Amino acid sequence: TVFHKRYLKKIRDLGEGHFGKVSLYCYDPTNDGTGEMVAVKALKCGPQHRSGWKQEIDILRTLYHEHIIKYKGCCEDQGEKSLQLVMEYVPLGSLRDYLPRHSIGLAQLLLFAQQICEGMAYLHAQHYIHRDLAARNVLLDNDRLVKIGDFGLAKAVPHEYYRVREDSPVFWYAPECLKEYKFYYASDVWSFGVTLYELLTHCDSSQSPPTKFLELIGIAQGQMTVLRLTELLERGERLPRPDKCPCEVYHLMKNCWETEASFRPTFENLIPILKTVHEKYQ
Ligand SMILES: COc1ccc(Nc2nc(-c3c(F)cccc3F)nc3c2C(=O)N=C3)cc1
């Protein structure tokens, strides 16, 4: 499907993706206003960013799931000699923005977690890794439905891992990614654990992974932030238990943060577990 540049009326900016800005447009061929509101992502950039942006479109073109953000079409970008990526508009935005301003119950948070896992199980079956599973990339469709966005770092697993570059969300990353630059399917599960930590804190800035890990590491020696993070995690230190987080949920969180990647559950293993834990607290 092809969106014509002439009928796009920009309303406002939505945010910053990995290789580009996301903006809210009204697409109005009629000139009426009935024409739908769409989230449009555009490239900014150097040579290696162009190669990645084309891959992001290629990835998102092929994905189709109720907990992955809907691809709608492409729009030709005469202004950047590029292709702008048109997606569905989720007015509620990310969980990172939403949860600080809305007191969400534990049961509802566990449903979101289940929903994220279902979307990630799908992604892993299509042989893709996400590589920035974080609360900022989980978009709320409505109160009972979340969708995974931003596949800017997403990559095709051929081989059980992808070898990463030296931008990298280190505070959501497993020791193997930080130490050996190998991203496994099990590395996305580590990130999910951190995303689940984020949910149970209501994405409170003061309890955020960067804030909590930099409290542990210190900033007196910034050059060795990643090495100190690596050492801390290999020592078995972990992000604390969020206030009013059930002990069993924190154990699940800890199982996602197992140092050895094979000891972590797959996203298929997690789905039934979260279903049960959800029904418990509902
Ligand atoms: C709360 O204020 C907002 C902010 C952004 C959105 N909307 C969106 N934001 C992203 C987005 C981003 F802007 C940066 C990083 C990661 C993201 F997922 N992606 C999408 C959408 C969307 O509607 N469709 C895809 C809605 C409300």
Short mmCIF file of N, CA, C and O in Angstrom, two decimals, residues 129-254:
data_model
loop_
_atom_site.label_atom_id
_atom_site.label_comp_id
_atom_site.label_asym_id
_atom_site.label_seq_id
_atom_site.Cartn_x
_atom_site.Cartn_y
_atom_site.Cartn_z
N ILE A 129 15.35 -11.33 16.17
CA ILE A 129 15.58 -10.84 17.54
C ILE A 129 15.24 -9.36 17.57
O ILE A 129 15.41 -8.67 16.57
N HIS A 130 14.71 -8.88 18.70
CA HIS A 130 14.30 -7.47 18.84
C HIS A 130 15.48 -6.54 19.16
O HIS A 130 15.72 -5.58 18.44
N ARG A 131 16.19 -6.84 20.26
CA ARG A 131 17.42 -6.12 20.71
C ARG A 131 17.26 -4.75 21.38
O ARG A 131 18.24 -4.10 21.71
N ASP A 132 16.03 -4.30 21.55
CA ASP A 132 15.71 -3.22 22.48
C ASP A 132 14.31 -3.39 23.04
O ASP A 132 13.46 -2.48 22.95
N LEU A 133 14.06 -4.56 23.62
CA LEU A 133 12.84 -4.78 24.34
C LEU A 133 12.93 -3.97 25.62
O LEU A 133 13.75 -4.26 26.49
N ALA A 134 12.10 -2.94 25.70
CA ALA A 134 12.10 -2.00 26.81
C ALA A 134 10.73 -1.36 26.87
O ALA A 134 10.02 -1.32 25.86
N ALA A 135 10.36 -0.86 28.05
CA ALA A 135 9.04 -0.23 28.27
C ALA A 135 8.73 0.90 27.28
O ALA A 135 7.57 1.10 26.90
N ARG A 136 9.77 1.60 26.84
CA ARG A 136 9.66 2.67 25.86
C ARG A 136 9.22 2.17 24.47
O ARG A 136 8.66 2.93 23.69
N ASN A 137 9.48 0.90 24.19
CA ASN A 137 9.07 0.26 22.93
C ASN A 137 7.80 -0.59 23.01
O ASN A 137 7.47 -1.29 22.06
N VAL A 138 7.08 -0.50 24.13
CA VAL A 138 5.78 -1.17 24.31
C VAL A 138 4.71 -0.10 24.30
O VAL A 138 4.65 0.73 25.21
N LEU A 139 3.86 -0.15 23.28
CA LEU A 139 2.85 0.85 23.03
C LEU A 139 1.49 0.32 23.46
O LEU A 139 1.16 -0.84 23.19
N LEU A 140 0.72 1.17 24.12
CA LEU A 140 -0.58 0.79 24.65
C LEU A 140 -1.64 1.11 23.60
O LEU A 140 -1.81 2.27 23.23
N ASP A 141 -2.30 0.08 23.08
CA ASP A 141 -3.41 0.26 22.13
C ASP A 141 -4.63 0.74 22.92
O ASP A 141 -5.23 1.76 22.59
N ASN A 142 -4.99 -0.04 23.93
CA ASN A 142 -5.99 0.34 24.93
C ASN A 142 -5.61 -0.29 26.28
O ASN A 142 -4.66 -1.07 26.36
N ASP A 143 -6.37 0.05 27.32
CA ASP A 143 -6.18 -0.48 28.69
C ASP A 143 -5.90 -1.99 28.84
O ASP A 143 -5.27 -2.40 29.82
N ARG A 144 -6.38 -2.81 27.89
CA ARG A 144 -6.16 -4.27 27.90
C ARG A 144 -5.43 -4.83 26.67
O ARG A 144 -5.56 -6.02 26.37
N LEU A 145 -4.64 -4.00 25.98
CA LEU A 145 -3.96 -4.42 24.74
C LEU A 145 -2.71 -3.57 24.48
O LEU A 145 -2.82 -2.37 24.22
N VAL A 146 -1.54 -4.21 24.56
CA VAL A 146 -0.25 -3.57 24.21
C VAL A 146 0.33 -4.12 22.90
O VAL A 146 0.02 -5.25 22.49
N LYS A 147 1.16 -3.30 22.26
CA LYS A 147 1.81 -3.63 20.99
C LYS A 147 3.28 -3.24 21.01
O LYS A 147 3.63 -2.14 21.42
N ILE A 148 4.13 -4.15 20.53
CA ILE A 148 5.57 -3.91 20.45
C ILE A 148 5.86 -3.03 19.24
O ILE A 148 5.46 -3.36 18.12
N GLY A 149 6.56 -1.93 19.48
CA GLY A 149 7.02 -1.03 18.42
C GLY A 149 8.53 -1.02 18.32
O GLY A 149 9.22 -1.83 18.96
N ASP A 150 9.03 -0.09 17.51
CA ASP A 150 10.47 0.12 17.28
C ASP A 150 11.31 -1.16 17.05
O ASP A 150 11.95 -1.69 17.97
N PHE A 151 11.31 -1.60 15.80
CA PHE A 151 12.16 -2.71 15.34
C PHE A 151 13.39 -2.18 14.60
O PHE A 151 13.86 -2.80 13.65
N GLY A 152 13.91 -1.04 15.05
CA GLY A 152 15.09 -0.41 14.45
C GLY A 152 16.37 -1.20 14.65
O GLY A 152 17.22 -1.21 13.78
N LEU A 153 16.49 -1.86 15.80
CA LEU A 153 17.63 -2.75 16.08
C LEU A 153 17.37 -4.21 15.71
O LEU A 153 18.31 -5.01 15.73
N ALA A 154 16.13 -4.55 15.37
CA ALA A 154 15.73 -5.93 15.07
C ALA A 154 16.55 -6.55 13.94
O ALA A 154 16.86 -5.88 12.96
N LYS A 155 16.88 -7.83 14.09
CA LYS A 155 17.77 -8.53 13.16
C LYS A 155 17.37 -9.97 12.90
O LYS A 155 16.84 -10.65 13.77
N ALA A 156 17.66 -10.43 11.68
CA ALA A 156 17.38 -11.79 11.25
C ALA A 156 18.44 -12.75 11.80
O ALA A 156 19.61 -12.66 11.43
N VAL A 157 18.02 -13.64 12.69
CA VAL A 157 18.85 -14.77 13.12
C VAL A 157 18.86 -15.77 11.96
O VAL A 157 17.78 -16.19 11.51
N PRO A 158 20.06 -16.15 11.45
CA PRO A 158 20.12 -17.13 10.35
C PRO A 158 19.56 -18.51 10.71
O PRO A 158 19.65 -18.93 11.86
N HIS A 159 22.66 -21.19 12.98
CA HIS A 159 23.06 -20.14 13.90
C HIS A 159 21.95 -19.80 14.90
O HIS A 159 20.79 -19.68 14.52
N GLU A 160 22.33 -19.66 16.18
CA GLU A 160 21.40 -19.29 17.26
C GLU A 160 21.54 -17.85 17.77
O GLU A 160 20.72 -17.41 18.58
N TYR A 161 22.56 -17.12 17.31
CA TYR A 161 22.80 -15.72 17.72
C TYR A 161 23.16 -14.83 16.56
O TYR A 161 23.56 -15.31 15.49
N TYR A 162 23.03 -13.52 16.78
CA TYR A 162 23.54 -12.48 15.88
C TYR A 162 24.67 -11.79 16.59
O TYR A 162 24.56 -11.47 17.78
N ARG A 163 25.76 -11.54 15.87
CA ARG A 163 26.92 -10.82 16.41
C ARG A 163 26.73 -9.31 16.27
O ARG A 163 26.72 -8.78 15.15
N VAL A 164 26.58 -8.62 17.40
CA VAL A 164 26.26 -7.18 17.43
C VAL A 164 27.48 -6.28 17.16
O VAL A 164 28.62 -6.75 17.14
N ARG A 165 27.21 -5.00 16.96
CA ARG A 165 28.24 -3.96 16.82
C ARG A 165 28.75 -3.49 18.18
O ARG A 165 28.21 -3.87 19.22
N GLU A 166 29.80 -2.66 18.16
CA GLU A 166 30.36 -2.07 19.38
C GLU A 166 29.42 -1.02 19.99
O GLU A 166 28.82 -0.22 19.27
N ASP A 167 24.11 4.14 21.46
CA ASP A 167 22.98 3.48 20.79
C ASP A 167 22.52 2.18 21.48
O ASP A 167 21.31 1.95 21.61
N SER A 168 23.47 1.35 21.89
CA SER A 168 23.17 0.07 22.54
C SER A 168 22.56 0.27 23.93
O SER A 168 23.19 0.87 24.80
N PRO A 169 21.32 -0.23 24.15
CA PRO A 169 20.69 -0.10 25.47
C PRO A 169 21.30 -1.09 26.48
O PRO A 169 20.69 -2.10 26.82
N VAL A 170 22.49 -0.75 26.97
CA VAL A 170 23.30 -1.64 27.83
C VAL A 170 22.59 -2.07 29.12
O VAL A 170 22.77 -3.19 29.58
N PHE A 171 21.78 -1.18 29.69
CA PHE A 171 21.09 -1.45 30.95
C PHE A 171 19.92 -2.43 30.84
O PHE A 171 19.36 -2.82 31.86
N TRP A 172 19.56 -2.81 29.61
CA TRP A 172 18.58 -3.86 29.30
C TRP A 172 19.25 -5.14 28.74
O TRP A 172 18.55 -6.07 28.31
N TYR A 173 20.58 -5.18 28.73
CA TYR A 173 21.35 -6.21 28.02
C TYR A 173 21.98 -7.26 28.93
O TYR A 173 22.53 -6.94 29.99
N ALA A 174 21.91 -8.51 28.47
CA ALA A 174 22.49 -9.65 29.17
C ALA A 174 24.02 -9.61 29.11
O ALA A 174 24.58 -8.99 28.20
N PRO A 175 24.70 -10.25 30.09
CA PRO A 175 26.17 -10.30 30.10
C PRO A 175 26.84 -10.78 28.81
O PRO A 175 27.91 -10.27 28.47
N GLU A 176 26.23 -11.74 28.11
CA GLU A 176 26.79 -12.24 26.85
C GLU A 176 26.83 -11.18 25.74
O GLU A 176 27.75 -11.17 24.92
N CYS A 177 25.84 -10.28 25.72
CA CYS A 177 25.79 -9.16 24.78
C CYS A 177 26.85 -8.11 25.12
O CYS A 177 27.55 -7.62 24.23
N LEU A 178 26.94 -7.78 26.40
CA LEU A 178 27.91 -6.82 26.92
C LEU A 178 29.36 -7.32 26.81
O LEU A 178 30.25 -6.56 26.44
N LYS A 179 29.58 -8.59 27.15
CA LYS A 179 30.92 -9.17 27.19
C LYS A 179 31.38 -9.65 25.81
O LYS A 179 32.45 -9.24 25.34
N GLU A 180 30.58 -10.51 25.18
CA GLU A 180 30.98 -11.22 23.95
C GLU A 180 30.31 -10.75 22.65
O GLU A 180 30.59 -11.30 21.59
N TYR A 181 29.45 -9.73 22.74
CA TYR A 181 28.78 -9.14 21.56
C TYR A 181 28.04 -10.17 20.69
O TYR A 181 28.07 -10.11 19.47
N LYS A 182 27.36 -11.11 21.37
CA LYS A 182 26.53 -12.12 20.73
C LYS A 182 25.12 -11.97 21.30
O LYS A 182 24.94 -12.06 22.51
N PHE A 183 24.15 -11.73 20.42
CA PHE A 183 22.76 -11.60 20.84
C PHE A 183 21.98 -12.86 20.48
O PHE A 183 21.80 -13.16 19.31
N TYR A 184 21.53 -13.57 21.51
CA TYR A 184 20.77 -14.82 21.37
C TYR A 184 19.28 -14.51 21.50
O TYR A 184 18.92 -13.41 21.92
N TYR A 185 18.43 -15.47 21.16
CA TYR A 185 16.99 -15.37 21.51
C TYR A 185 16.82 -15.18 23.02
O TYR A 185 16.00 -14.38 23.47
N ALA A 186 17.61 -15.91 23.79
CA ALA A 186 17.65 -15.79 25.25
C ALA A 186 18.06 -14.40 25.77
O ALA A 186 17.74 -14.04 26.91
N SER A 187 18.78 -13.62 24.97
CA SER A 187 19.11 -12.23 25.30
C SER A 187 17.88 -11.30 25.30
O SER A 187 17.81 -10.38 26.11
N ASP A 188 16.94 -11.53 24.38
CA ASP A 188 15.64 -10.80 24.40
C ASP A 188 14.82 -11.09 25.66
O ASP A 188 14.09 -10.22 26.13
N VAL A 189 14.93 -12.31 26.17
CA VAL A 189 14.26 -12.71 27.41
C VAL A 189 14.86 -11.98 28.62
O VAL A 189 14.13 -11.59 29.52
N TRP A 190 16.18 -11.82 28.64
CA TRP A 190 16.82 -10.97 29.66
C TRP A 190 16.20 -9.58 29.65
O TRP A 190 15.80 -9.07 30.70
N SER A 191 16.15 -8.97 28.47
CA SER A 191 15.55 -7.63 28.28
C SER A 191 14.09 -7.57 28.73
O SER A 191 13.68 -6.58 29.34
N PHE A 192 13.33 -8.63 28.44
CA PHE A 192 11.94 -8.73 28.91
C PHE A 192 11.84 -8.62 30.43
O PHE A 192 10.99 -7.91 30.95
N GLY A 193 12.70 -9.35 31.13
CA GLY A 193 12.83 -9.24 32.59
C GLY A 193 13.00 -7.82 33.08
O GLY A 193 12.37 -7.41 34.05
N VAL A 194 13.85 -7.05 32.39
CA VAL A 194 14.09 -5.64 32.72
C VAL A 194 12.84 -4.82 32.38
O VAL A 194 12.43 -3.94 33.15
N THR A 195 12.21 -5.12 31.25
CA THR A 195 10.92 -4.52 30.88
C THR A 195 9.84 -4.81 31.92
O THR A 195 9.02 -3.94 32.22
N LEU A 196 9.83 -6.03 32.45
CA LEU A 196 8.89 -6.42 33.49
C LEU A 196 9.19 -5.68 34.79
O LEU A 196 8.27 -5.24 35.48
N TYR A 197 10.47 -5.52 35.11
CA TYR A 197 10.89 -4.67 36.22
C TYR A 197 10.36 -3.24 36.04
O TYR A 197 9.80 -2.67 36.98
N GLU A 198 10.52 -2.69 34.85
CA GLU A 198 10.00 -1.35 34.52
C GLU A 198 8.50 -1.21 34.75
O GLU A 198 8.05 -0.20 35.29
N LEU A 199 7.74 -2.23 34.34
CA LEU A 199 6.28 -2.23 34.51
C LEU A 199 5.87 -2.18 35.97
O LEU A 199 5.04 -1.35 36.36
N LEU A 200 6.47 -3.04 36.78
CA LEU A 200 6.16 -3.11 38.21
C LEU A 200 6.61 -1.89 39.04
O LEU A 200 6.08 -1.66 40.13
N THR A 201 7.56 -1.11 38.51
CA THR A 201 7.89 0.22 39.07
C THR A 201 7.02 1.37 38.52
O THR A 201 7.15 2.51 38.96
N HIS A 202 6.14 1.04 37.56
CA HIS A 202 5.31 2.00 36.81
C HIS A 202 6.15 2.98 35.98
O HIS A 202 5.79 4.14 35.80
N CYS A 203 7.27 2.47 35.44
CA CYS A 203 8.30 3.28 34.78
C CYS A 203 8.63 4.59 35.51
O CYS A 203 8.76 5.65 34.90
N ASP A 204 8.76 4.49 36.84
CA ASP A 204 9.18 5.62 37.66
C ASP A 204 10.65 5.90 37.32
O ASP A 204 11.48 4.99 37.44
N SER A 205 10.94 7.13 36.90
CA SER A 205 12.30 7.54 36.50
C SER A 205 13.35 7.23 37.56
O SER A 205 14.42 6.71 37.24
N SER A 206 13.03 7.54 38.81
CA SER A 206 13.93 7.31 39.95
C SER A 206 14.26 5.84 40.24
O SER A 206 15.30 5.56 40.84
N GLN A 207 13.39 4.93 39.81
CA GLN A 207 13.64 3.49 39.92
C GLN A 207 14.06 2.83 38.60
O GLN A 207 14.05 1.61 38.50
N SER A 208 14.44 3.63 37.60
CA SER A 208 14.77 3.11 36.26
C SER A 208 16.09 2.33 36.25
O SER A 208 16.96 2.59 37.08
N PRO A 209 16.23 1.35 35.32
CA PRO A 209 17.47 0.58 35.22
C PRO A 209 18.75 1.41 35.10
O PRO A 209 19.70 1.12 35.82
N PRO A 210 18.78 2.45 34.22
CA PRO A 210 19.96 3.31 34.22
C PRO A 210 20.26 3.94 35.57
O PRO A 210 21.41 3.92 36.01
N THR A 211 19.23 4.48 36.23
CA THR A 211 19.39 5.13 37.53
C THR A 211 19.87 4.15 38.60
O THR A 211 20.80 4.46 39.34
N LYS A 212 19.22 2.99 38.67
CA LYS A 212 19.57 1.98 39.67
C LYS A 212 20.93 1.34 39.43
O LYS A 212 21.67 1.12 40.38
N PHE A 213 21.26 1.05 38.17
CA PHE A 213 22.58 0.50 37.84
C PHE A 213 23.71 1.52 38.02
O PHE A 213 24.78 1.15 38.48
N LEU A 214 23.47 2.78 37.67
CA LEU A 214 24.47 3.84 37.88
C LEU A 214 24.66 4.20 39.36
O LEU A 214 25.74 4.64 39.75
N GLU A 215 23.62 4.02 40.18
CA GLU A 215 23.76 4.04 41.65
C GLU A 215 24.72 2.95 42.14
O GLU A 215 25.53 3.20 43.02
N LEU A 216 24.61 1.74 41.58
CA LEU A 216 25.50 0.62 41.91
C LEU A 216 26.93 0.78 41.36
O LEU A 216 27.90 0.47 42.05
N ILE A 217 27.04 1.23 40.11
CA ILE A 217 28.34 1.38 39.44
C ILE A 217 29.08 2.64 39.89
O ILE A 217 30.30 2.62 40.07
N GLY A 218 28.34 3.74 40.06
CA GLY A 218 28.92 5.07 40.26
C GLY A 218 29.25 5.71 38.92
O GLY A 218 29.24 5.05 37.88
N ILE A 219 29.51 7.02 38.95
CA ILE A 219 29.87 7.79 37.75
C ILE A 219 31.25 8.45 37.86
O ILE A 219 31.61 9.28 37.02
N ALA A 220 32.00 8.08 38.89
CA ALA A 220 33.36 8.57 39.09
C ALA A 220 34.32 8.06 38.02
O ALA A 220 35.36 8.67 37.78
N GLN A 221 33.98 6.91 37.43
CA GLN A 221 34.73 6.32 36.32
C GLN A 221 33.77 5.88 35.21
O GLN A 221 33.37 4.72 35.12
N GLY A 222 33.42 6.85 34.36
CA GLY A 222 32.47 6.66 33.27
C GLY A 222 32.94 5.83 32.09
O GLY A 222 32.14 5.15 31.45
N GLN A 223 34.25 5.89 31.80
CA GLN A 223 34.88 5.05 30.76
C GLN A 223 34.65 3.53 30.93
O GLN A 223 34.60 2.80 29.93
N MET A 224 34.50 3.08 32.17
CA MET A 224 34.31 1.65 32.48
C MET A 224 32.91 1.30 33.01
O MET A 224 32.76 0.41 33.84
N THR A 225 31.89 1.99 32.50
CA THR A 225 30.51 1.72 32.90
C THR A 225 30.06 0.31 32.51
O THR A 225 29.47 -0.40 33.33
N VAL A 226 30.33 -0.08 31.27
CA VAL A 226 29.91 -1.39 30.75
C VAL A 226 30.65 -2.55 31.42
O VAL A 226 30.04 -3.57 31.73
N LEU A 227 31.96 -2.39 31.62
CA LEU A 227 32.78 -3.42 32.27
C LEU A 227 32.34 -3.64 33.72
O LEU A 227 32.24 -4.77 34.19
N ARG A 228 32.09 -2.54 34.43
CA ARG A 228 31.56 -2.58 35.79
C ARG A 228 30.15 -3.15 35.87
O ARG A 228 29.81 -3.83 36.85
N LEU A 229 29.33 -2.87 34.86
CA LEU A 229 28.01 -3.47 34.73
C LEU A 229 28.12 -4.99 34.54
O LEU A 229 27.47 -5.74 35.24
N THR A 230 28.95 -5.39 33.59
CA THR A 230 29.28 -6.80 33.33
C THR A 230 29.71 -7.56 34.59
O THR A 230 29.18 -8.63 34.89
N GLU A 231 30.69 -7.00 35.30
CA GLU A 231 31.23 -7.61 36.53
C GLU A 231 30.18 -7.76 37.64
O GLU A 231 30.13 -8.79 38.31
N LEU A 232 29.37 -6.71 37.81
CA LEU A 232 28.25 -6.68 38.77
C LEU A 232 27.23 -7.80 38.51
O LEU A 232 26.79 -8.49 39.44
N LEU A 233 26.88 -7.99 37.24
CA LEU A 233 25.92 -9.02 36.84
C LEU A 233 26.48 -10.44 36.93
O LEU A 233 25.79 -11.34 37.41
N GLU A 234 27.73 -10.63 36.49
CA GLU A 234 28.42 -11.93 36.64
C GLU A 234 28.67 -12.34 38.10
O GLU A 234 28.81 -13.52 38.42
N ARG A 235 28.74 -11.34 38.98
CA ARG A 235 28.78 -11.51 40.44
C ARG A 235 27.42 -11.91 41.05
O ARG A 235 27.36 -12.32 42.20
N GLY A 236 26.35 -11.78 40.27
CA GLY A 236 25.00 -12.18 40.68
C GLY A 236 24.12 -11.06 41.20
O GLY A 236 22.99 -11.30 41.63
N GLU A 237 24.63 -9.82 41.17
CA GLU A 237 23.86 -8.65 41.58
C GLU A 237 22.80 -8.32 40.54
O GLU A 237 23.03 -8.48 39.33
N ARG A 238 21.65 -7.88 41.01
CA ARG A 238 20.48 -7.67 40.18
C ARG A 238 19.70 -6.45 40.63
O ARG A 238 19.84 -6.00 41.76
N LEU A 239 18.87 -5.93 39.73
CA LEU A 239 17.94 -4.85 40.04
C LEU A 239 17.00 -5.28 41.16
O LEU A 239 16.56 -6.43 41.17
N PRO A 240 16.69 -4.37 42.10
CA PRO A 240 15.97 -4.82 43.29
C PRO A 240 14.52 -5.21 43.02
O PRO A 240 14.02 -5.07 41.89
N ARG A 241 13.87 -5.73 44.04
CA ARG A 241 12.47 -6.12 43.96
C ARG A 241 11.63 -4.84 44.00
O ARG A 241 11.74 -4.08 44.97
N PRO A 242 10.80 -4.59 42.96
CA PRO A 242 9.93 -3.40 43.00
C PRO A 242 8.92 -3.45 44.15
O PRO A 242 8.48 -4.54 44.52
N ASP A 243 8.59 -2.29 44.71
CA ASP A 243 7.62 -2.21 45.80
C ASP A 243 6.27 -2.76 45.35
O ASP A 243 5.81 -2.46 44.25
N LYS A 244 5.66 -3.58 46.21
CA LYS A 244 4.40 -4.29 45.91
C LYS A 244 4.49 -5.26 44.71
O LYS A 244 3.49 -5.52 44.03
N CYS A 245 5.69 -5.80 44.46
CA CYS A 245 5.89 -6.88 43.49
C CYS A 245 5.80 -8.18 44.26
O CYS A 245 6.53 -8.36 45.23
N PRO A 246 4.89 -9.10 43.86
CA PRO A 246 4.86 -10.41 44.51
C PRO A 246 6.18 -11.17 44.38
O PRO A 246 6.84 -11.07 43.35
N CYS A 247 6.54 -11.90 45.43
CA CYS A 247 7.80 -12.64 45.49
C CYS A 247 7.98 -13.57 44.29
O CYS A 247 9.06 -13.61 43.69
N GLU A 248 6.92 -14.30 43.95
CA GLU A 248 6.93 -15.22 42.80
C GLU A 248 7.19 -14.53 41.46
O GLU A 248 7.87 -15.08 40.59
N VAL A 249 6.64 -13.32 41.29
CA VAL A 249 6.87 -12.52 40.09
C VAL A 249 8.33 -12.06 40.01
O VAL A 249 8.90 -12.01 38.92
N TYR A 250 8.91 -11.72 41.16
CA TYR A 250 10.31 -11.33 41.23
C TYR A 250 11.24 -12.52 40.92
O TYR A 250 12.29 -12.33 40.30
N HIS A 251 10.84 -13.72 41.33
CA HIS A 251 11.57 -14.96 40.98
C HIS A 251 11.58 -15.22 39.48
O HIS A 251 12.61 -15.57 38.91
N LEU A 252 10.42 -15.03 38.85
CA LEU A 252 10.30 -15.12 37.40
C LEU A 252 11.23 -14.11 36.74
O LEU A 252 11.95 -14.43 35.80
N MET A 253 11.20 -12.88 37.25
CA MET A 253 12.11 -11.81 36.84
C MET A 253 13.58 -12.25 36.92
O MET A 253 14.35 -12.07 35.99
N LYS A 254 13.94 -12.82 38.07
CA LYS A 254 15.29 -13.37 38.32
C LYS A 254 15.67 -14.53 37.40
O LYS A 254 16.84 -14.67 37.03
#
